Amino acid sequence: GCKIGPSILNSDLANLGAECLRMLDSGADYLHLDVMDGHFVPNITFGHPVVESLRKQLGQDPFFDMHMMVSKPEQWVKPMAVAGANQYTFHLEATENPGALIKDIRENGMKVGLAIKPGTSVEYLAPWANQIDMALVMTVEPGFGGQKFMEDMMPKVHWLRTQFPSLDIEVDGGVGPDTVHKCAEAGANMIVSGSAIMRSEDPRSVINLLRNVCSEAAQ
Amino acid sequence: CKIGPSILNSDLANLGAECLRMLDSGADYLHLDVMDGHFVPNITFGHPVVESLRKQLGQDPFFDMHMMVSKPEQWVKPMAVAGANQYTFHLEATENPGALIKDIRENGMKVGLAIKPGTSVEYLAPWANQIDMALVMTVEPGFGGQKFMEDMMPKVHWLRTQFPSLDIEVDGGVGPDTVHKCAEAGANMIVSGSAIMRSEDPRSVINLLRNVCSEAAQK
Ligand SMILES: O=C(CO)[C@H](O)[C@H](O)COP(=O)(O)O
Ligand SMILES: O=C(CO)[C@H](O)[C@H](O)COP(=O)(O)O
Ligand SMILES: [Fe+2]
Ligand SMILES: [Fe+2]
Provide DSSP, A9-71.
TTS-GGGHHHHHHHHHHTT-S-EEEEEEBSSSSS-B-B-HHHHHHHHHHH-SSSPEEEEEE-S
Q: How deeply is A162 buried, as exposed, middle or buried, from its count of CB atoms within 10 A (0-12, 13-18, 19+)?
A: exposed
Interface contact flag, B46 A42, Cβ < 8 Å: no
DSSP summary character for residue A92: G
Largest CA-CA distance found in chain B, in angstroms, rounded: 44
CA distances to B65, B138, B139, B175, B197 from B145, rounded to whole Å, are 19, 11, 9, 10, 11
Distance CA A209, CA B2 (A): 52
Amino acid at B55: K
Distance CA B102, CA B111 (A): 9
Q: How deeply is A133 buried, as exposed, middle or buried, from its count of CB atoms within 10 A (0-12, 13-18, 19+)?
A: middle
Q: Which ligand 1 atom sits closest to the C-alpha of A36? A: 4
Interface contact flag, A15 B48, Cβ < 8 Å: no
Distance CA A210, CA B9 (A): 37
Phi, psi angles (nearest 5°) of residue B87 = -115, 110
* Helices and strands in chain B, H and E counts: 8, 8
Asked if A125 and A132 touch (Cβ cutoff 8 Å), the reply is no
Nearest-CA residue for atom 9 of ligand 2: B172
Interface probe with A: pick from B45, B75, B81, most Cβ of A within 10 Å: B45
- Give the bridge partners for A35, in sequence order: A68
Neighbours of B45 (CB within 10 A): 26
- Give the bridge partners for B63, in sequence order: B30
* Nearest by CB: B49 against A14, A54, A56: A14
- From the list A53, A54, A55, A35, the residue with the least C-alpha distance to A45 is A35
Distance CA A95, CA A111 (A): 18
From chain B, which residues contact A within 8 Å (Cβ)?
8, 11-17, 19, 34-38, 41-49, 51-53, 55-57, 69-71, 74-75
Quote the minimal CA–CA distance from B37 to chain A in Å.
6
Across A164-199, b (16+ Cβ under 10 Å) vs e yields beebbbbbbbbbbeebbebbbebbbbbbbbbbbbbe
Neighbours of B108 (CB within 10 A): 10
Interface probe with B: pick from A31, A43, A44, most Cβ of B within 10 Å: A44
The H or E element spanning position B33 is strand B30-35
Q: How deeply is A152 buried, as exposed, middle or buried, from its count of CB atoms within 10 A (0-12, 13-18, 19+)?
A: exposed
Residues of A in contact with B71 (CB under 8 A): 38
DSSP summary character for residue B23: H
- From the list A136, A192, A141, A194, the residue with the least C-alpha distance to A160 is A136
Distance CA B53, CA A124 (A): 40
Distance CA A19, CA B77 (A): 27
The length of chain A in residues reads 219
Query: Does the beta carbon of A143 lie inside 6 Å of ligand 1?
Result: yes
Which regions of B116-180 does DSSP assign to beta strands (E)?
Answer: 133-137, 167-171
Asked if A18 and A12 touch (Cβ cutoff 8 Å), the reply is yes
Interface contact flag, B49 A45, Cβ < 8 Å: yes
Asked if B163 and B129 touch (Cβ cutoff 8 Å), the reply is yes
What DSSP string describes A153-211? GHHHHHHHHHH-TT-EEEEESS--TTTHHHHHHHT--EEEESHHHHT-S-HHHHHHHHH
Any binding-site annotation on A172? yes
Three-state secondary-structure class, residue B218: coil
How many contacts, defined by CB atoms under 8 Å, are there between A and B?
A: 110
Say how many Å lie between the CA of residue B139 and the centre of ligand 2.
7
- From the list A54, A61, A64, the residue with the least C-alpha distance to A17 is A54
The H or E element spanning position A3 is strand A3-6
The pairing of strands A190-193 and B2-5 is unpaired
Asked if A36 and A70 touch (Cβ cutoff 8 Å), the reply is yes
Distance CA B86, CA A120 (A): 39
Distance CA B95, CA B90 (A): 11
Q: If phi over 0 gives left and psi between -120 and 50 gives alpha, with beta otherwise, what is residue B77? A: alpha
Domains and CATH numbers, chain B: 1-219 (3.20.20.70)
- Give the bridge partners for B30, in sequence order: B63
Three-state secondary-structure class, residue A112: strand
Say how many Å lie between the CA of residue A20 and the centre of ligand 3.
15
Asked if B199 and B27 touch (Cβ cutoff 8 Å), the reply is no
Interface contact flag, B45 A42, Cβ < 8 Å: no
Residues of A in contact with B53 (CB under 8 A): 13-14
User: In the β-sheet with B189-192, what is the strand arrangement from edge to edge?
Assistant: B2-5, B189-192, B167-171, B133-137, B110-115, B86-90, B63-68, B30-35
The H or E element spanning position B50 is helix B47-57
* Nearest by CB: B53 against A14, A54, A56: A14
Distance CA B171, CA B151 (A): 13
Residues of A in contact with B42 (CB under 8 A): 47, 49
CA distances to A81, B9, B45 from A49, rounded to whole Å, are 11, 9, 9
CA A187 to chain centre: 16
Neighbours of A146 (CB within 10 A): 14
Question: Based on C-alpha coordinates, what's the Rg of chain A?
Answer: 16
Neighbours of B120 (CB within 10 A): 9
Up-side HSE of residue A150: CA atoms within 13 Å toward CB? 18
Say how many Å lie between the CA of residue A137 and the centre of ligand 3.
10
Phi, psi angles (nearest 5°) of residue A66 = -90, 110
Asked if B178 and B159 touch (Cβ cutoff 8 Å), the reply is no
Distance CA A101, CA A121 (A): 20
Asked if A104 and A74 touch (Cβ cutoff 8 Å), the reply is yes
Catalytic residue annotation of A: 34, 172
- From the list A74, A166, A103, the residue with the least C-alpha distance to A129 is A166
Asked if B4 and B64 touch (Cβ cutoff 8 Å), the reply is yes
Nearest CA in chain B to A143: B48
Quote the minimal CA–CA distance from B139 to chain A in Å.
19
Distance CA A36, CA A143 (A): 7
Distance CA A189, CA A187 (A): 6
Residues of A in contact with B43 (CB under 8 A): 35, 37, 44, 46-49, 70, 76
Ligand 2 pocket mutation, candidates B171, B174, B206, criterion most atoms within 8 A of CB? B171
The H or E element spanning position A104 is helix A98-107
